[PDB]
Design a protein around this ligand. Sequence first.
Ligand SMILES: *CC(=O)c1ccccc1
Ligand SMILES: *CC(=O)c1ccccc1
Ligand SMILES: *CC(=O)c1ccccc1
Ligand SMILES: *CC(=O)c1ccccc1
Ligand SMILES: *CC(=O)c1ccccc1
Ligand SMILES: *CC(=O)c1ccccc1
Ligand SMILES: *CC(=O)c1ccccc1
Ligand SMILES: *CC(=O)c1ccccc1
Lengths: 244, 244, 244, 244, 244, 244, 244, 244
Amino acid sequence: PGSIPLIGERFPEMEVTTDHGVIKLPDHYVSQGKWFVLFSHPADFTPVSTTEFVSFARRYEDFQRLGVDLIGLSVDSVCSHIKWKEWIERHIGVRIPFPIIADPQGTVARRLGLLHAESATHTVRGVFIVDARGVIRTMLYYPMELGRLVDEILRIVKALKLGDSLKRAVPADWPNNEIIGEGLIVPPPTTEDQARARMESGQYRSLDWWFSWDTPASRDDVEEARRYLRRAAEKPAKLLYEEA
Amino acid sequence: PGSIPLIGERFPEMEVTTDHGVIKLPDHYVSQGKWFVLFSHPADFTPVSTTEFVSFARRYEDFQRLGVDLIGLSVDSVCSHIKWKEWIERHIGVRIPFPIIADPQGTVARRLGLLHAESATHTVRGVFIVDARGVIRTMLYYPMELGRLVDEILRIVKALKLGDSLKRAVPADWPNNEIIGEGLIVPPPTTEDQARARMESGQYRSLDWWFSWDTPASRDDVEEARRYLRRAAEKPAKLLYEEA
Amino acid sequence: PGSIPLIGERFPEMEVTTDHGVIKLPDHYVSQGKWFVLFSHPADFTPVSTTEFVSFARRYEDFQRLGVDLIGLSVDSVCSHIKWKEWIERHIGVRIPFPIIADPQGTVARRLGLLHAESATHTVRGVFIVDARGVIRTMLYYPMELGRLVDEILRIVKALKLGDSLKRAVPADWPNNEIIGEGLIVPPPTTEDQARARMESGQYRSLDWWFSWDTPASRDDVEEARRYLRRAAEKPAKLLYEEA
Amino acid sequence: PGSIPLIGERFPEMEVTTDHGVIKLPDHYVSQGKWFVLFSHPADFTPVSTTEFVSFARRYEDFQRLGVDLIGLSVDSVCSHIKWKEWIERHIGVRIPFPIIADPQGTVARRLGLLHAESATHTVRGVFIVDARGVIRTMLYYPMELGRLVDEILRIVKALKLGDSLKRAVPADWPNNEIIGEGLIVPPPTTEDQARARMESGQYRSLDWWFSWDTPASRDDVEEARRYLRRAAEKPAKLLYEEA
Amino acid sequence: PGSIPLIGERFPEMEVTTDHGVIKLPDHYVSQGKWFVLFSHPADFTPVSTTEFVSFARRYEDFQRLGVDLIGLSVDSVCSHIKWKEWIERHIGVRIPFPIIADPQGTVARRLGLLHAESATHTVRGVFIVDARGVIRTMLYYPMELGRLVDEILRIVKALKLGDSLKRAVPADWPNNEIIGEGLIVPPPTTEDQARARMESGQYRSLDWWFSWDTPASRDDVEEARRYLRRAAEKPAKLLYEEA
Amino acid sequence: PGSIPLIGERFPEMEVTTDHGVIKLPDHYVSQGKWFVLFSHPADFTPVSTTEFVSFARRYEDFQRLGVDLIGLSVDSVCSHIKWKEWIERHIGVRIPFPIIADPQGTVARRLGLLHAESATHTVRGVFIVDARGVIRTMLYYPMELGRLVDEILRIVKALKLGDSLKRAVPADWPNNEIIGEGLIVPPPTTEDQARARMESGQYRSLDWWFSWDTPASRDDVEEARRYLRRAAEKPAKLLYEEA
Amino acid sequence: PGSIPLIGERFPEMEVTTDHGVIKLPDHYVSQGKWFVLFSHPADFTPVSTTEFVSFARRYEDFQRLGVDLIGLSVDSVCSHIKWKEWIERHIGVRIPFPIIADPQGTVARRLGLLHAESATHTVRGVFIVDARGVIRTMLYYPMELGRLVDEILRIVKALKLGDSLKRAVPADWPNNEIIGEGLIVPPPTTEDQARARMESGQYRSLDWWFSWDTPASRDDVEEARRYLRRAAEKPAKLLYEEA
Amino acid sequence: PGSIPLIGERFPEMEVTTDHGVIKLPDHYVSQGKWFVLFSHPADFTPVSTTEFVSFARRYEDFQRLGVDLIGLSVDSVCSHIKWKEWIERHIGVRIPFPIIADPQGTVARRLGLLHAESATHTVRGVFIVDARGVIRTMLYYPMELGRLVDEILRIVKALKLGDSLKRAVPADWPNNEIIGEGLIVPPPTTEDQARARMESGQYRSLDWWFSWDTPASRDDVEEARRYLRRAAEKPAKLLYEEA
Ligand SMILES: *CC(=O)c1ccccc1
Ligand SMILES: *CC(=O)c1ccccc1
Ligand SMILES: *CC(=O)c1ccccc1
Ligand SMILES: *CC(=O)c1ccccc1
Ligand SMILES: *CC(=O)c1ccccc1
Ligand SMILES: *CC(=O)c1ccccc1
Ligand SMILES: *CC(=O)c1ccccc1
Ligand SMILES: *CC(=O)c1ccccc1
């Protein structure tokens, strides 16, 4: 009982008001050759939401390195956005460098299917991953009660950019796939003639005509992805509530 | 665009044909006191999809530990499901123990919004996480070209059940949150009287009246969650393609 | 190009979330035999809106003495309402004791015609004066750029309650009408026989059969109303920006 | 409910018949560089309405000083308007110099939402404040039983023109605001960069980055506005009923 | 064009506000066994309308003698109707004893088709003659520029009443018809047998089987009708403007 | 339950078949600069209708003098109209010189609202007075049972023509008006400035600024209008039945 | 309760995905001058369907000899088609050289009416015989439980082609018709003149003017058709499951 | 395009007129425990149609043996049917013993989709095979130019009845299937547990878990079905045209 944009569609044309000013999505980021992650949170001055903004801010340099920008969204006003960011910088010691959309009539929220049954008034924890052509590539809907794993958003963007450059599909749990490890998958043949040719070429390691792979990702690309998952797995050496 | 079910809605009533028989969802899992993860893949005998089925099968006991059942979905028929499972058992040495829905007219696909612009004929990589009351708790839409991180699906279910059983919300990147670590968040006050009572009480560690937390998770709960992430971050010991 | 509820209509039945809790309008006030003033402001942490909250708070006991409750309204969340009130108490030294409705999807705003062409997202400065029978008695629409004169809101409610108890209409600028001063107007005759009877009864001061008046308001009633206007007219002895 | 035009919309284009002739609204005042106040009353030869006409007439020069024209409205005919004006001059000694719209089919009444539930036949006491560009700036709906405070209408137009002149918003109860007195408010920053640039310039008195103000109003502007309210607050020297 | 109620239809049920009070049409007159003449005029304090009201008032006793009540209608208010009657009594020396409907939104006017293309806002000079069963017997539409001949309204009600009691049709120009004088017409036969049986019976004077008549009206009936027409033809002995 | 054309509307364009041939209304009379009176009767060989045709025929020259043509209408055929005229000439000694519309399907009757509740099959006694511009000036609907007073139709056309030529409105019962006798009324002023100018000009006899008149009709115009009413009031010199 | 395309209609324009690539029907075959038999089967890895694909593959050269291509259809994906063909080749020793449409959303099935009541999800056993102009010539619907007689499809195509080149209709059970054996039927006369002429010209053997025939089919054409039926009648010497 | 009833649906309820009288379909045959073959032909006294009727008549005993009744259909009237049957008996020496539906407004034809683009007026050569429960089991649409192979209609009802009786599916070209000969197919498993159980029971000859078969048909069943085909393949002994 709700409506979304879909993977492979252009992010819907819209003007949004952020605490950084007015911008056109996805044009603002397409014009810069950037990907963007648009994510939502229910309200300013909410605790899970605060832990997420801090997690994104900590990973901001990692997103920037991938050519990826971040843009938040809640139904709160720009004035609440700025007060909350000031609260976070003051009490947690973390500056939030990226804009937050203000969506008080829920116009953006209804366009993106961010209003679920869990709340009539407040957005769930949506994630739109949009590439530099302004095309939606991945969509996640986390609930109110559960913070995102931001390292998985880095892994998704890194794996998509690698798959796009190297003309490969990405196995489950890459770069630690149980069958092929850091291998990447050759898109399968679409005809009997191609299936025959691929097999009788011996160009790739294969389990069958429809399951071929190689290992074309650079050590640097693989170690960058492994770094995100290592950070997700390791307990942080110091907690930020300690000097708050 | 397209239409979807929403977080907090009852998974829609439907009878489906699987390679284990005909079942009503969600009724079939509710009656066993079980959560289910329903996930979709484009087609049988596709390589990324095969890696995902193998990843789910390795983690089958981890899902059963949480009282979670797995059910797959593609537009292929039962006969194709059974032959693809026999192929994975014979060639990779992995038995797929969970059922797969056969959805040849895309009836289930259209109901769950699993047909995106990337393909008019084959589902993307949808994930519906459904609790023992038949309520949709989380929805993920991964694309054709990118395998899922199955350990994040385990982390989501674990954290959702933890939040339900302790009346807590779960911070970003839990149990390795950068502010509060393995801490869990008390739902914030919703009135000025509750906010006052909270600031006067001293019961919780707190950054403000809206940001309180404690550490009520068992070490077992925390370390099991962290183990999912350590497994995602770990280079596999032996690649299944070799033993194949 | 907008719609409204009308004077003489029952305030529309609605459930609203305030920073004090959930209430039904107009029932929650009708139940108590109380009038309410519902007023709106564009957003929390806006300066004209802050001056108006401080003006209502200073007049709170004046409202309480007439049996009139106050309830604010904006499209911000409850958490922004509590933080804004905290800010006003800390920086201006004034407790806002009355509730504010949180209307993030604009549901209440659209119902009360509070969204004008001046902002698609934020409410203008509306005022609904609602009697103890739940009937809209008066409606004011001030713009973004102009704070209300809260003493005129007191005069309106006092004048309405007097007209109700004494069965009189209230002249322009009462209690300082240039024609009849503190006099109150007998509703005019509706028939020729009623007109002739009124005139030949000599019961009232008259300028014509359609313009009769007396002075049935007590000295206290008149003095209460005159104090509202003297306060509006007088520069306050100390400005609150001193200590602030 | 019923329909209205809205603050920030152009007053609706309309030809109206007045006791002074046929005029186009708002063009007839826009082309003179005049603001106008259009106000409604239920019927000619009604007592409250008569008090309000006399109130407006006594303040006629105050409106002319501000470059504001007055235009009345009821469902009565021109002939009745002229007879009622004659009666007021003869019995009260006050000439009504401004036009009255004759609206016998309620055509203008329905366009401006002046028919409320209190009467299906006669307009309530509507007030439309229209600027010299023809834009609706403020709307007031007083009921049948309650005369308007005309000095507040003067205060509104004066404060609006002052805000437009000096690019300021006007605080509650101006020029006797309890926080900043006769101070006028700088419209708040809309971006984090403007918020920071504002606070660092030290250009204004500030309570916070969103609450800045200065005292740019002339002593004349301030005392004119206070004079309106002192007149509202002063018991009249001589009641005009005495001299009939 | 426009639409109307019709001869032989029941006058439409309506509650109307008059300067004598609220009444229900036609019930108010039916319940008394009285005919009524409802007539409209564009506006109070118009000159042709005034002459028509004085003409009706002069003929009031002639109407009452027939068991016929008068009721007027304009889009003016009750207050204007009472002032207009005051004017006529003071300046012409004539009392208007019959009620005038106040129709300010033109609801009655629209129902009776009294708004013609001569004016969007004021009724023409309609006349509805309604019998004691509440049935529309005759309808006249005079224009703004032309006063009615009120003696023809008397002729119509007297002839219709005569026709009803004597079971006769009334010739052109009765009682001065050029063929049969004060003769009244027997309704013509509806069948060949009735036609033959009327010629044979020799009961009536006849020009053919379809044209039979007799003289059943009393001398007083005829003289009453003749008196109306003689008054119409005679220039009044003294003009009322002279005596003022 | 009926539709009519309206005073001030152009007579509807139509082609009609008469017993004189096919003509277009109103063009046929406009072309000649003639007024026309279109009148209806229920059916040929009916006795009231025959009295009306004889009355029209005897007044024919009075209509021709005024530049007014006559045209009848019934639902009977041309053949019936010719046989009916032959009968009247033979049995009554009166030639009918004007045409009669034949309206067998009631096409014209329905267009002019001539079919009332009194009969679903035959027209009532309608009268359309149409000026030389083809504009409907007056409409009368007499019933089946009551013949018209043809002299009032002459008086209407005469008074209308005189009103048009002299730019005057015609009082009740003109030229025998009880207030101003043969006086004609100046249209009332439309503005306060016109009211005052007219009153201080002394140009007209006046009861008030809205009630001015003079005597600009020739004695010939006045005596001709009065002669119509004298004839209406005269007992006929000899009845046509006696030679008939 | 289903819709089909019809004999004599052009096969509907559609782009289809086969395990040989993407083709446009009927264009792909028309541009080659080829007939095509489009046949459907419920699903890959079903036993009746397998028997039918082997029967078609065994007759592939008989189809090729007639200039007829074969194209299959099921709701299975291309990868399943290729895996199923590998299985047939490996286990039955028969290569399927013709393409199979993949119709996973049943788009083609619904267009062609191939979804009957026996299954909502899987196509019945449809056969469309389409000529070299792209016109549907014959449609067969066999059910799930009954394999087709593929020699009758060869007989149909052979008889239609023969009927096309010789301008003849083909009797029941041709080439073994019990009345005229291998004779072909002259289309009957359409007029009485053609009937008389046919019968007197004595050009053909005849039973009546509507039943003429000759023997224009070549010895080779007849024997080819007889060979199809002899193969259908004869049990194979060795069954393929025995060399399996 | 056209509409059709479907395999697995009840034959639609209809009353039809035949040359044997009125009957209800399918109830007429259901109530006897009889299958029926309803077939259509364009028109009586057409040559292909005649050959087909003669083929059905000669095979009537084979249909009667199987408990199958025959019923024809064309748009011709009953009289034409009887004249046509008389002609066949006289000129060909063959009695048609089964009824023919007369369908002159093509009511039955439209309901069964028997009017294709080949003729707007005459049906094509449709065949409905309906079982004793009144269910459509098979549908064939042969065109105008091509006679049916009646022996294939016998093979279909024989194979269907055998399949119903032995709970088996029938392979292509049965009883001469090139893989399993006169073997009949066990419906494949629908679950993995059923698949495994079947492969372990060793109860059936198998090519795979989805392809099991046995030989449960009597030698008489097999040889009767094979005889149908031998008859189709046999050059006839004596052509009936010779003795005609
Ligand atoms: C800052 C902000 O959110 C704002 C400012 C003016 C009006 C409404 C909202
Ligand atoms: C096994 C399977 O998918 C199947 C079986 C019979 C019919 C259709 C599909
Ligand atoms: C406090 C508040 O406004 C809130 C709390 C939880 C979720 C959304 C908003
Ligand atoms: C003066 C006035 O109101 C008027 C005049 C003519 C007709 C109607 C109204
Ligand atoms: C008297 C009259 O017409 C009136 C009175 C009150 C309100 C409106 C009209
Ligand atoms: C004369 C007449 O009315 C007529 C003539 C022919 C047909 C119909 C009507
Ligand atoms: C296997 C097949 O046909 C396919 C391949 C890639 C994606 C979807 C289906
Ligand atoms: C001849 C036949 O079928 C028939 C009989 C009577 C009426 C119409 C048709």
